[PDB]
């Protein structure tokens with residue numbers, strides 16, 4: 001038993017809700033919140049900009065030190081950093097950005113990072129400003145992640161299309 005509430009169950013291990021991930025994180029304080037990161041951990045907009053704003057820019061300060069030490073992530077890769085006031089940990093995961101011409105096959109590799117964590121609160125990778133089809137992203141999520149994933153979908157209209165079209 002865990003503290004996630006109001007989710008619809010899609011599969012044995014995948015759950016979905018219409019929610020603002022920032023507010024969902026603030027209330028649940030999950031062990032892991034996933035950020036829709038880029039390779040530079042520049043949290044300017046989308047999910048990343050919202051999460052970072054909710055940390056009063058502490059996520060960005062920590063991220064800049066991480067990059068200065070380690071260099072950029074790989075597309076499809078991830079790193080574990082602090083969850084600040086939102087979660088114990090933040091798993092920064094880089095899905096391919098279709099608006100940068102990145103290979104969508106890397107979306108499966110991106111979701112594989114979730115399997116290193118028993119339970120996660122997450123957005124749909126490569127959705128939103130990353131330019132991928134959120135229905136495809138949901139399919140890859142279901143077919144790749146084996147751990148327990150609670151997906152927060154900000155847009156109510158999108159949440160309903162994702163549910164109604166789910167196979």
Ligand SMILES: O=C(O)[C@@H]1CCCC[C@@H]1Nc1ncnc2[nH]c3cc(F)ccc3c12
Pocket residue numbers: 019020021022045046047049050123124126127128129130152153154155158
């Ligand atoms: O659902 C959507 O509209 C999109 C799905 C994936 C790409 C961007 C959006 N992502 C999110 N997903 C969950 N919570 C969120 N809070 C947010 C707050 C913001 F200021 C911007 C985006 C989100 C967001």
